[PDB]
């Protein structure tokens, strides 16, 4: 039906972060790994693209790369002191950009590309050249603060793309919905005092950043009311995430009236993920994509951009990604998710489901949406 | 303080199960993995032993191997038709023992060793040669039915050891507590009609076998009252698992009065596990070990055996295993768990904790323990 | 300069062969591998394509896939009894097609694709739509006999493409030059009695098939004089391989006067290869490509097809492949081979070089070329 | 027959060197590896010990660890400026100790252990507590210069052990025979001016250090005549290496009359090694061990120590190591090398063999041994 862009570049798969045993740095009591290392591996993302190819989906999409984000683009978000230190470490062979921010040689130029893919996806959709678009942006962006890398993120991908669109393409109100299972603390910080961007994060209560829930953080000054955190309970599955979208996110969008919806699209709420404890399956992600595409249809002429964030289940993320691209493009391949029925049977029973529904009801009331 | 046995054999690390992408068999829509493959990898278990060595713990334990379980030992549990088919597949190069039971060449002899390590651990403790013991039994046992492999298990390790002890060492009542995060369906089936073994399983509601909770399954005929299932909510952490032990398991043991406690000790309730959604840390496992050691001290002269089951977080399981061996032996090394404080901060907040406490209270009432 | 085809398909990277420690099957005394497994891994070939992309070469080539080779195409070479057994094993989950021929689920359809890429490359060049072409055909073909898989090969890729071109496109004389470091025993067998195809193999003396040199095997009946084996000494490097091309292969082509040259292009003579003992570098492969392209220019209007075979050095093969594609297309990227100068310094000294030159001189005399 | 020490420590397997694709550092044109990384991996050495265990050999050996080499031990070879910089990099998380010397966190203490295992092996044999001994020393030592790391070596293991034995145990003349396939440039440098140690290196001509042969380097001043380099031709196999031992090494030992023979025992001349081009099999290494054990029996009361160096064929090195330990201890297990007959068939034919024999004859004449 739609003309759907897929923005990606081989170079994004070349970003490295040194030797880790899953998330632990090697040394001391942490033995080096015999096989695969850091959880933020290129394979998480490359396997999704590989499955899109063998499924026959890829040739029916508009495939694109992009020019890297320029220095000027980076500077709408990040000060030079941060950028220079990121680039120095990148240029000297890789190393640490403060605690638990490892990067590799040439990571700077690859992070600029990753942000440039997001910039170009936003631009194509805004200019009406595409109906909607997905950016396979690695490294991710949603934890990055202006002057601090965190949670495997080095540049604030979505804010860079948005700020560029506001400066060059007259973009007005935009909503950012972050269903990566971790809290989008970088996006929240950047837009905390602004009423022209609504930031919504669904996330696992207390997961990352650790110990953060955030429901009382609504924004400050002019931005008060324009930040929504939905801390879902660890263990929640398909029913809970879809109910939260239905009850909180879709009504919030209706009230705000954006001209563009952007999804920070992680898959780490999937049921086999080592970096969170949620129980989503590929049909969960397909249903959430349909819900936000339908909202985009009602509110901003169908303009929807999705930007890849997290997801660390190497065998399972591809099936979730494929589902999203199928829902986005309107094209169904012959692929059947081999774990779907298994994960459907593992879903929380009625007691938990109702408990979580009531917690979501209390949040919607607290946010003035019910 | 204690004389603690550690039973293990290099050959257990040589059991293989063919090519998988985590748990998915390769083929069709599942792309072959570039690095590590099946989640049930030798590294999950070998890294624990490696950390015990470098920590200085190993030389303070009684290290042992064992003779494999004999055919006669296997036949107290398993009929010959199953055993012959397992051995035929093992002897012909590996393959499938029905659906989703892959094994490799020589797996039969390695499964017999794994069960023999459990037999010998039970025997050493029963005969008073050791105070307590741990068996690093791979492949695991707690899903195996008499005539059906399941959940990476090929022989019923703990039942074989128990049935041998009943036949050769006059063992009477024994309690089996299974804190692997999946349901011990094999142990439950084998002892379902018996009052001489109490089987207790704490597990994630609906996880594996998928869609099974089990609270109403209490045993049949003479065995009614002697099976206890505790389906904990996905997402539960340290508070919940320890409260369930305190409120249900310790009182159940006090009522039953065993002569030996055996733990089916998996670590897959750890907070980084891809095969479940629980939030335990190394101190959770240390505290659960202390609770059951203390019960063994009160009830059966300190006689406690632990038998390794699951745990698939390759970087994290070693820290959990070390904690158990430290608590079992009474010796504290200088190792500090580098994720402990991180996972403590991710723990469910009070709302969930109280909800899960009330669910556990309802189970204890239903089981006549409150 | 040229219009160069690059024929490849994502599905070729999905062929698997079960669990191996490099080339050894697991079991018995062979411990399962912790990381990567069979040497014939998709990464050997995928890393070459990945480097072509990041170098900027790929968009300057004519990229294509192909229809799989049909049953009729396969049957010009292979009898049905072989084909049916290959397909049965493929369809039943993978397994063994006799000794040391492991394949995986769906390998049949992927081998048909691999052969179809070669068919299409030959066709495009023959019809004048491309000047020259490379096929990234995996699994490889040059060891496959009509009724027997061997050396990781399941279908005879190049013979299938040639026989199809003879039947459908009026192809006459064709020369096949095989510089994979192992002997092309499948190609040699298929064309042994034919004067319409000249098969030339440069290979490591005695490497694979093991213990075979082959210099006295010249062909039989009408085919006598139309098979040339050049068993080079283990340890030989750039000087030796280029001298053999210069002294034996180029004059043999001049005498035969082909209408098309096909290269069976392996990279396993590279200096870091675990499956042979030769000392070639990326400039060796670039120089050999230039030599055969120049011959094609003199003899058959520039018509040259290259078909990927072997090469198992995962970090080094990409640099060798890139060099070939640069020489084939006439386009030089900015990539500099980081091991080039190192391997140049390891090359055999003058004593060995002259010894090997004299051995090549004796062969050229024996073949009537000097 | 013999009482054979095997000195090893789990901690030696914990030394890491960052992210590499085989030997290439990641970055620039080198894509990060999906699976295993640096060729100098713990698995090369751990798989040998694992096979010794499952073969039943290990319990028949004298197993030992050791105290790390002290600062005083290190300072007999290395100046403080080098040692302090090695330790600073080790203590700060790992990094580079000049070009192509990557090390990891804590590598300093693990290198001191590796050297301490060699010290203790030499001591046990010298004091008559063992007949002979093997040290599984990782990281290796034979390339290390006093003030420069090279070729994966950080401390000069064998020189440290020898210099300590000369200072504390009255050791006189000692011969060091290095059959690692690369040149022992560190040992050669350290003893170049000394007549109390004879250093002999068999190595692949020009391999590592690259472009070095060394036959004319015989020693300087008092040390002239006490260094022997044997640059064997790339491609050489069992016949050549054993003939060189027979014709050059055994007569050189007979002339020098040592009180102790030490072997720098690498396995990287094995026929599947990516880091050299030789064709040895497990029986080659067994025969070389017998030759030097027999010399030790004739010359120095059977006193032989072997110290692990290189070997990077992960599936094959274990079989070669097992063979050495079988020959050293006098105990034959039931293990049969599954590649033995294959590699026997790949061996160079008579033409090459005789050529290499004549080259060895010329060296023996040049060294005054024929
Ligand atoms: O996917 C992400 C990043 C999530 C990071 C979660 C795990 C972080 C971690 O493991 N932290 C840690 C590591 C070592 C020591 C202490 C904390 N964001 O969307
Ligand atoms: O650790 C265990 C075994 C748990 C197994 C859980 C995952 C099983 C799985 O992934 N099942 C599956 C695979 C392919 C297709 C459908 C189901 N028991 O303690
Ligand atoms: O690259 C190839 C295939 C070469 C195969 C060489 C190694 C074969 C092997 O390792 N054989 C073997 C394995 C196990 C036992 C005995 C032989 N052809 O071009
Ligand atoms: O095993 C050893 C060490 C041998 C090292 C051989 C390979 C070195 C290498 O690959 N060098 C290189 C890497 C990158 C760029 C240039 C040279 N010694 O016994
Ligand atoms: K989120
Ligand atoms: K805002
Ligand atoms: K359980
Ligand atoms: K019971
Ligand atoms: K060849
Ligand atoms: K012919
Ligand atoms: K040497
Ligand atoms: K000397
Ligand atoms: Zn995330
Ligand atoms: Zn489990
Ligand atoms: Zn080959
Ligand atoms: Zn070496």
Numbering used by the authors:
A (entry chain A), B (entry chain A), C (entry chain A), D (entry chain A): 2 to 371
The authors write:
All active site residues were conserved, as shown by the multiple sequence alignment and the structural alignment, suggesting a general acid/base catalytic mechanism for the bacterial enzymes as described for the eukaryotic counterparts. These enzymes mediate catalysis using a penta-coordinated catalytic Zn2+ ion coordinated by two aspartates and a histidine (KpHdaH (1b): Asp181, Asp269, His183).
We solved the X-ray crystal structures of KpHdaH (1b), RwDmhA (1b), and VcHdaH (5b) in complexes with SAHA to a resolution of 1.95 Å, 1.75 Å, and 1.64 Å, respectively. As described for mammalian Zn2+-dependent HDACs, the hydroxamates coordinated the catalytic Zn2+-ion in a bidentate fashion, the carbonyl oxygen replacing the carbonyl oxygen of the acetamide in the substrate and the hydroxyl group replacing the position of the catalytic water molecule. This Thr24 is not conserved in bacterial deacylases, exemplifying differences in substrate specificity or inhibition due to differences in structure and sequence of bacterial deacylases. Inspection of the structures of the KpHDAH (1b)•SAHA, KpHDAH (1b)•TSA and RwDmhA (1b)•SAHA showed that the binding site of the inhibitors is created by part of the L1-loop supplied in cis, and by the C-terminal α-helix supplied in trans, i.e. by another monomer of the oligomer.
